[PDB]
Subunit: 428 residues, 3 copies
Amino acid sequence: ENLMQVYQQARLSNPELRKSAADRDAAFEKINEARSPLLPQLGLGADYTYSNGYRDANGINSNATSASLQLTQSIFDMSKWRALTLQEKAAGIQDVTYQTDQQTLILNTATAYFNVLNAIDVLSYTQAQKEAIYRQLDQTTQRFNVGLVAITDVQNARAQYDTVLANEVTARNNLDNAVEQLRQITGNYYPELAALNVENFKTDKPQPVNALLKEAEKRNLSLLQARLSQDLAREQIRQAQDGHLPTLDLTASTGISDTSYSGSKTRGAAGTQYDDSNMGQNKVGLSFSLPIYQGGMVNSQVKQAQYNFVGASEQLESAHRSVVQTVRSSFNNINASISSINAYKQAVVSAQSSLDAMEAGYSVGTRTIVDVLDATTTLYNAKQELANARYNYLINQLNIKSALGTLNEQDLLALNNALSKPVSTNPE
Amino acid sequence: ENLMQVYQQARLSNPELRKSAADRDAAFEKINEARSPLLPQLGLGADYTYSNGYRDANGINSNATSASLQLTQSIFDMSKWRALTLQEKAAGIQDVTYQTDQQTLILNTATAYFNVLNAIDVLSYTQAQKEAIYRQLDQTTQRFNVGLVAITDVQNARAQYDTVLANEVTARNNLDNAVEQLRQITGNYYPELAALNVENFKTDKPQPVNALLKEAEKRNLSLLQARLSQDLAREQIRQAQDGHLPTLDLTASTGISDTSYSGSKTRGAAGTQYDDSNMGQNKVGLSFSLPIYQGGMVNSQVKQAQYNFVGASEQLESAHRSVVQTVRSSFNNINASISSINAYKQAVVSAQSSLDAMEAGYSVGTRTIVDVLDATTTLYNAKQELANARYNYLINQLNIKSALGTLNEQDLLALNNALSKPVSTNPE
Amino acid sequence: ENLMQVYQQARLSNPELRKSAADRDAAFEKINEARSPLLPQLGLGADYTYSNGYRDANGINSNATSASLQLTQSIFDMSKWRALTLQEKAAGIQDVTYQTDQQTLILNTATAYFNVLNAIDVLSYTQAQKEAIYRQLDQTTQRFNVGLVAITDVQNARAQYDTVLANEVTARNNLDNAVEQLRQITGNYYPELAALNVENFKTDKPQPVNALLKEAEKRNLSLLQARLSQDLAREQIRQAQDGHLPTLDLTASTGISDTSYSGSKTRGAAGTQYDDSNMGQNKVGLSFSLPIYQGGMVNSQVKQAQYNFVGASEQLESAHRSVVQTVRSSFNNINASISSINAYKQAVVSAQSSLDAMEAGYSVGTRTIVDVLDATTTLYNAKQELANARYNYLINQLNIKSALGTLNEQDLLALNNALSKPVSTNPE
């Protein structure tokens, strides 16, 4: 099927990405984990407690039975608020990766596709080679059959042929694995897939890396992912800087306290005191806590987070040149890829007229037919080689589109569009 | 020596594996950790306090002389139970991970093994290459000695030769290399291993992938490791589901309270109250703790695990198609691997008579001896390439077994079967 | 320019390294964290409570007006002491990790360095290739212009040429590539670096592995990093051994207790008791806490660490043979590396006269000029390959130094010594 359909099936059917999607979600969910702390704290304990003294305190004993409701709010404590934005930035960062992931599958989506095609391509080529080398070896036999050759002559082409199987075999295997690569990502055995339409494929001189480089710099996701990551730890700078902060928290609870004395010193005058332990109480208010001196723990930590931010600060640079280098990297790849095709494109023509060289050389019976097959084999090679390049240039686009981050399902269609007629994977 | 012991040796001597076995064993301890808390917690503590009022509460003073014994138990908490099953799965996965290293170790031991043969193998080749290529260079000078060549023939011929030298040493390097590969996992200098025996060696047709794939699916351990990985995540959601329940736990304490008052408000008539009095007490019972509202934290927690499982849920599918892939991965390999030998095996035959063609042609002297060296050396290359594929098929054999999960120390034996007579690595 | 500064530059400008230095520095802070707790913990807190009975305890009411100061110290806990040494080792390892990046950075700076030379190198080659291969194609048409060729010669020849173009651009690509490789670590556009000087360049025989291996064993830092890694785990068991001991800690508090009763049971004759009292108090002393039974948790904990150390214990052996391997890894490399140059160095000589053979043959015109271009370009390939091995030996030099751990900014200097006269990367 065409790449977009190839894609759409995969973009849903792709489990890796699909894992990203979830892995994306749990993040944004964690935001909830983030805020709930900013929520009041509601809960219920209960305890069955019996005090029994074994000493002078003996005889003074009771069943302590109690029920209490409790809620506390975090009065003063921005570190949570800090930590809040942290997961906020986590979400943003974690958000980043998924965005990467789309292109990733996007990227990989095209890859295996045309790979299948390449295997589709090779699978096409090598057979013709076998279609030839068999012949060559074939009549060599009948040269030995005619005795016009010796057995090494006999033998060499024999293996020389069998090496073809040694090729074609692996080819189809590659054919199949071409399948699985796509079925893996996609999840379906795909009989056919769109070949590359040659007349409608224009070699396209790409953009200046200067802008694109700056383009993805606003864009490129890992570089994006780091930047927020640099942004992320930035708060980590200020999370442990929230250890400095004192805390104040809402203190709210209620419940019944029910006691009955027991044992010896439960026995007495009671003085309007000794009675059945039964009541309930209410305690409402705040809890403020200001750390004064912890031993520099919060101090050392800040630097820790601080010096983290440095390496964090590092990673931007470590990332930026990379994304930088990544930029021209893809850039120089496509152009080189541009060059190759124009070479092999020439090359195809080479074999082309070269291939003709057989026919009008064969139809005049000057040169043999197997040779035609030989050259017949050859043309497909560039048609192999060329095709491969024809995929690469398309390949590099996404990588660029990828590295740019500009890569989108529009960068996919431009692939899919030049995809015009399908070819099956079916080895015959 | 023999791959079996060679395996068997490093099977023990393998630090990785041994690390694994322990590392596996390490986890299986952790299960204990999980259950531990569900035991009573018996503990003891001591505190020396002195309370001095600095205000109207001044003169309210005593030695705080106190100690007590404390035990604690968990009555109702499922999360601990959750924790209980969790590490069970962790061990469940961890346990799985271990076997992975068997085939892992198993795979390697065979893996690095034949490389010795290869390194041995090629080394055999390249040596004769020098024997061939040198004598050529050897004769070439004889021409320049007869003037029959110029130096250009000579320098290149010499150069032609030297590359041979360049070639060979690396082998011996690789020789040791391939040797050390084994020593690495194994750890013992090995003079000679039993190489493949062309007599026993049998190219062998495997089972249907559709059958194989299922089998490993019951077998392949990473995939197994995957399901438990997923299965592992199963708990976690249920773990995250365990913030709901209240917690009931066993509350027990005993110890002495020894009170000596002090200061002005300790002084007086004492009101039949104030006086260095010293006691000890017991508190035993349950802690029921029912969460009410954490802010849906437990709630958002779950979804976290929820997606968390699903993103894991991907891995199954993610790994399954891949393990499906791997299923089709090597199953192709071996077959194409099969095609390999059949080519070179013929190809050997090709060179075989090719050699023979030489010797006779040299025997009758119609041709030089250098050619025989050429071909003779030439023969080895196939015989060289031969051993490789001979191993590679064998190599892919286990990989399938690994991928299948069918791999075992019996599958080692299968390899261990076609190895007849060892030969050293010592370069002569 | 010069590798030294080139190194020296990125040695600072290297974000990775700099990350490391900080990252190293980051840990060394954490040591502070470890010691911090063993300091007194000075702290302050405030709570506003109001207690209202809703039952017979109703009318039992007051403003809870309270605040206090609190400091805390650890008297006897070794685990903290354990914690103390732990991060010490962590720093101990972390400290080790840092140097790794020196050689790391050191290795790279040299590493990516000569690639510039290579990229420079090959680029020099391929250019002449075009000069050769074009003129060929150039003359070929002249034949087709004379009819002396058909187009098949032509197209292929043209095709033959175009591949050259395909070839070269990648170099320049790689040119920038190799350039950016350096800028990545370094970060500055570099016109020209000093290339290898065939005059100073000396193939040099190393020390005995048996001697070298030991040396790195005192040196190679990952292995060093390993032992501390093991050494690190040493504590942890002992850490896990520290759940045994009781814990004695300094218990100190001061603050005001300001009590204003309220409600019905606040009202009355007060019994010389009920009233708007307000106080402040001091509590100082020790916390002795002796664990008794956690369920063997401490016990099972240890074994965890116990095996944990051993599985780590593997790494030593695991890494040791490997570092042993690495010892034999490159030590072979360099030597085989040596063999490399000796071949190509001759090989250069082979092409050398080979060129010369051409020029004379062209000088006398016995042959075309294209050949000279062919050979002339041909010469570069050796001269091309030459520079590589020339670097590779040099390259392996440091790797050994790294593997040895002997690698340093002096070893950079050794490389920095054979670099005579820089040359730009700018493709002309």
